[PDB]
Amino acid sequence: DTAKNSSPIAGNIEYTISTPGSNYAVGDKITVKYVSDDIETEGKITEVDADGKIKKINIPTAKIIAKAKEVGEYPTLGSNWTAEISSSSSGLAAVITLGKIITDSGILLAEIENAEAAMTAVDFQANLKKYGIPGVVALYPGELGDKIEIEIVSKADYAKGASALLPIYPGGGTRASTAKAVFGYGPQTDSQYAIIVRRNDAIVQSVVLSTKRGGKDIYDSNIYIDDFFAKGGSEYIFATAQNWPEGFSGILTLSGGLSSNAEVTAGDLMEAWD
């Protein structure tokens, strides 16, 4: 069929800011209802302009997806579903129109020598910005990449240790940060992020990398994201600094991994056996 690498884009809900309105604020809550009953109440406005016009929002999808599957509307959704901004907000007049649950990861990597071109392609990048997440994906295409989860902690949030409750994307909820428990040494600049890669409850990689060209670890090793990955720094994931949200901390669930039927080996099955 079609090969795809698991990404943080799949699993999100399409949205359009049909009318931006005005006087809204970041943090204003958003409710998604099904046939006029609350399903998800922890959506939020994530970007506004100077006049309070809504620019970006974030809607967690775990409860929406669970319900959609129950009622036979996954992942199309449709006109049974509505989004609204909490009545407590100062804003007015905005209209948010919901679409489907995204199943396309939006990315396929082949040889890591051409991966940066894929990672920085305009369509993929537009979706990273729209959903407010960094571009971190499974290195190899296939369903197995869905089992990779990334935990990312900024310098400011690293200092907080387990007091930092990290939001989980795109599903919702939070989880206490493990970065201070896992690393001896944390981010050294505000361009640096502790990245923990887990597969099947096991940390398979953990490293502090930078979104700033030229930044290095204590051994003068290059830790700028795109370089680190282009040079084969990971056997599990690939990433870009482009549109990495400044100060991002959070947990990324990857999905949408898909194999080309002809390319699957018995080895891939063994590796999936858990």
> What letters, b where the CB count within 10 A reaches 16 and e where it falls short, cover 179-212?
bbeebeebbeeebbbbbbbbbeeeeebeebbbbe
Cα(145)–Cα(130) distance, integer angstroms: 22
Cα(71)–Cα(78) distance, integer angstroms: 12
Cα(127)–Cα(133) distance, integer angstroms: 9
Cα(120)–Cα(130) distance, integer angstroms: 15
Q: Are 186 and 158 in contact (CB under 8 A)?
A: yes
Token pair in block for residue 260: 């080309």
SS3 244: coil
CA distance to 6, 149, 153, 166, 214, per residue, from 124 (Å): 13, 19, 23, 24, 25
Answer CATH for 12-102 from 2.40.10.380, 2.30.110.10, 2.130.10.10, 3.40.718.10: 2.40.10.380
Q: Are 179 and 153 in contact (CB under 8 A)?
A: yes
SS3 57: strand
Closest alpha carbon to 271 in 112, 149, 145: 145
- Sheet of 29-34, strands arranged across: 54-58, 37-48, 29-34, 81-85
Cα(27)–Cα(12) distance, integer angstroms: 19
Q: By what technique were these coordinates determined?
A: X-ray
Q: Are 261 and 1 in contact (CB under 8 A)?
A: yes
- DSSP codes of every residue in 138-153: ESS-SGGGGGEEEEEE
Tally: H helices and E strands in the chain: 7, 14
Closest alpha carbon to 137 in 1, 29, 9: 9
- DSSP codes of every residue in 169-210: ETT--EEE--HHHH-SS--SSTTEEEEEEEETTEEEEEEEEE
How many residues would you count in the chain? Answer: 274
Question: Cis before residue 20, ω within 30 degrees of 0?
Answer: no
The separation between CA 215 and the C-alpha centre of its own chain, rounded to angstroms, equals: 24
Which parts of the chain fold into alpha helices (H)? 62-71, 115-119, 122-131, 155-158, 179-182, 225-230, 266-272
Cα(119)–Cα(101) distance, integer angstroms: 22
> What letters, b where the CB count within 10 A reaches 16 and e where it falls short, cover 71-80?
eebbbebeee
CATH code of domain 260-274: 6.10.250.2160
SS3 content of the chain, % helix, strand, coil (to 5): 20, 35, 45
Closest alpha carbon to 244 in 190, 207, 200: 190
Closest alpha carbon to 239 in 209, 213, 263, 259: 209
Resolution attained, angstroms:
1.8
Cα(52)–Cα(73) distance, integer angstroms: 33
Q: How big is the chain by its Cα radius of gyration, in Å?
A: 19
DSSP assigned state of 272: H
* Distance, first Cα to last Cα, the chain: 24
Ranges of each domain in the chain: 2-11+103-259, 12-102, 260-274
Cα(143)–Cα(155) distance, integer angstroms: 32
Angle at 162 between CA 58 and CA 130, to 5 degrees: 15
Q: Are 193 and 216 in contact (CB under 8 A)?
A: no
